[PDB]
Scaffold this active site. Structure first.
Site, PDB file in Angstrom:
ATOM      1  N   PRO A   1       7.801  14.523  -0.239  1.00 18.07           N
ATOM      2  CA  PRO A   1       8.041  15.518   0.797  1.00 18.07           C
ATOM      3  C   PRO A   1       8.992  16.671   0.438  1.00 18.07           C
ATOM      4  CG  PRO A   1       9.383  13.506   1.138  1.00 18.07           C
ATOM      5  CD  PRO A   1       8.217  13.180   0.200  1.00 18.07           C
ATOM      6  N   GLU A   2       8.934  17.760   1.202  1.00 17.89           N
ATOM      7  CA  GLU A   2       9.828  18.903   0.980  1.00 17.89           C
ATOM      8  C   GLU A   2      10.864  18.921   2.112  1.00 17.89           C
ATOM      9  OE1 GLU A   2       7.257  22.395  -0.274  1.00 17.89           O
ATOM     10  OE2 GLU A   2       5.786  20.796  -0.498  1.00 17.89           O
ATOM     11  N   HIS A  91       3.779  -1.867  -1.174  1.00 16.86           N
ATOM     12  CA  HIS A  91       4.754  -0.960  -1.868  1.00 16.86           C
ATOM     13  C   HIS A  91       6.127  -0.834  -1.178  1.00 16.86           C
ATOM     14  CE1 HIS A  91       1.772  -0.151  -4.890  1.00 16.86           C
ATOM     15  NE2 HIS A  91       0.907   0.227  -3.966  1.00 16.86           N
ATOM     16  N   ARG A 109       4.843   5.137  -5.973  1.00 19.05           N
ATOM     17  CA  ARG A 109       5.100   5.533  -7.369  1.00 19.05           C
ATOM     18  C   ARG A 109       6.458   5.069  -7.936  1.00 19.05           C
ATOM     19  NH1 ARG A 109       2.911  11.583  -8.531  1.00 19.05           N
ATOM     20  NH2 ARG A 109       2.987  10.804 -10.678  1.00 19.05           N
TER      21      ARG A 109
END
Ligand SMILES: [Zn+2]
Length: 271
Positions: A1-2, A91, A109
Site C-alpha cells: 500500500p501507499e 499467510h 510475500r
DNA sequence: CTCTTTGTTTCTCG
DNA sequence: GCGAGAAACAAAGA
C-alpha cells in the site's frame, strides 16, 4: 500500500484498538520482527495501546508511555481484527490478542517489518531513513521542492518514488499524479519549469488527499480492516493500458521506467 | 517446464 | 557519489 491506504488503516485502528490491553502476542513468523520477537513479546505483553500514528507509508503503534512499534506493510501486508477463536490463514504471521479479539498481521510475500523502539528514538529513526515531508500544504514546501528538482538530472518518476522529495507516493499514485500534472515520467527534473513544478506540487497534495477521503484504492488485495476503498474508480491511468485518456482520447500506454511498470498518456504527457 | 509481473525498500557492482 | 539490476518472497498468468 501507499500513504492513502496506510492512513485509512491507521484511522480504523485508532477507532477500534486504542485503550486495549495486550493480553498476549504470538508469531508463526518471528523473523519479521527486526528488533527481536521474544524481546518485543516480553516488553509489550500487558501494555495498553494509547494511540496509532503514521509517517509516510509507516504505521506507528503507541504502546504504554515509552514504546513505539513501527510497522511497514511493504507490497502485500494486511491487518484484520478477528475473534479469539478465528482459524489460522495461510499467510498470517503475528497476532496481538486482546480480551475481546485479536489483531492479526498477514503478508503473502513476507516483506513487511516490525521494529520496537522507544518514544525518543522515533524522530531519529525517520531522520536516518531520510523521509521527506508529509504531502500537506503545511508541511510540503514548494520552494525547497523546486530547488531540489533544479539541481538534479534524475528522471521525475524514480526521484518521486524515493520518498525524499515528499513522503507517501508509490507506483499507483506517482502515475496518477504525473498524468494529472501533464508530465512525462522520464522527464529529467532540471528540465521542469516553475509553473510545471507548481502544478506537480499541488497535484501530489490533491490526489493523496482525495485518495484518503475515498478510503484508498482497492485493486487486488487492499482493504482497510475488511473495508473496500473507492479511489480505484477514480484512477485515470494506472492499470489502464489500452484504454482511452479521459482528456484527449489517446490510448494509455505502458512502459518500463527504472524497473517499474509505468502508465501514461503520450499526448498529455509530452516526452 | 520457463519467463514475467506485482501497492516497497535497500543492497551490490562497476 | 551514481544508475542498473537485483534480492527479500509468493503467487499467478502467458
Ligand atoms: Zn491524454
Amino acid at each position: 500500500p501507499e500513504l492513502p491506504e496506510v492512513e485509512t488503516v491507521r484511522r480504523e485502528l485508532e477507532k477500534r484498538i486504542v485503550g486495549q490491553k495486550i493480553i498476549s502476542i504470538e508469531a508463526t513468523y518471528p523473523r519479521m520482527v527486526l528488533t527481536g520477537f521474544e524481546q518485543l513479546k516480553k516488553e509489550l505483553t500487558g501494555k495498553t495501546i494509547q494511540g496509532i500514528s503514521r509517517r509516510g507509508k509507516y504505521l506507528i503503534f503507541e504502546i504504554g508511555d515509552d514504546f513505539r512499534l513501527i510497522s511497514h506493510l511493504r507490497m502485500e501486508g494486511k491487518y484484520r481484527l478477528a475473534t479469539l477463536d478465528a482459524p489460522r490463514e495461510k499467510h498470517d504471521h503475528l497476532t496481538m490478542k486482546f480480551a475481546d479479539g485479536q489483531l492479526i498481521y498477514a503478508d503473502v510475500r513476507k516483506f513487511g517489518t516490525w521494529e520496537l523502539i522507544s518514544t525518543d528514538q522515533v524522530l531519529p529513526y525517520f531522520l536516518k531513513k531520510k523521509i521527506g515531508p508529509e504531502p500537506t500544504y503545511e508541511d510540503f514546501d514548494e520552494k525547497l521542492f523546486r530547488e531540489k528538482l533544479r539541481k538534479s538530472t534524475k528522471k521525475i518518476k524514480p526521484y518521486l518514488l524515493e520518498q525524499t522529495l515528499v513522503a507517501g507516493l508509490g507506483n499507483i499514485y506517482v502515475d496518477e499524479v504525473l498524468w494529472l500534472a501533464k508530465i512525462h515520467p522520464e522527464k529529467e527534473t532540471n528540465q521542469l519549469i516553475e509553473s510545471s513544478i507548481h502544478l506537480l506540487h499541488d497535484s501530489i497534495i490533491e490526489i493523496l488527499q482525495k485518495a484518503i477521503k475515498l478510503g484508498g484504492s482497492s485493486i487486488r488485495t487492499y482493504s482497510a480492516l475488511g473495508s473496500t476503498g473507492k479511489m480505484q474508480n477514480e484512477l485515470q491511468v494506472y492499470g489502464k493500458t489500452g484504454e482511452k485518456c479521459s482528456r484527449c482520447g489517446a490510448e494509455i500506454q505502458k512502459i518500463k521506467v527504472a524497473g517499474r511498470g509505468t502508465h501514461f498518456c503520450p499526448v498529455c504527457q509530452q516526452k
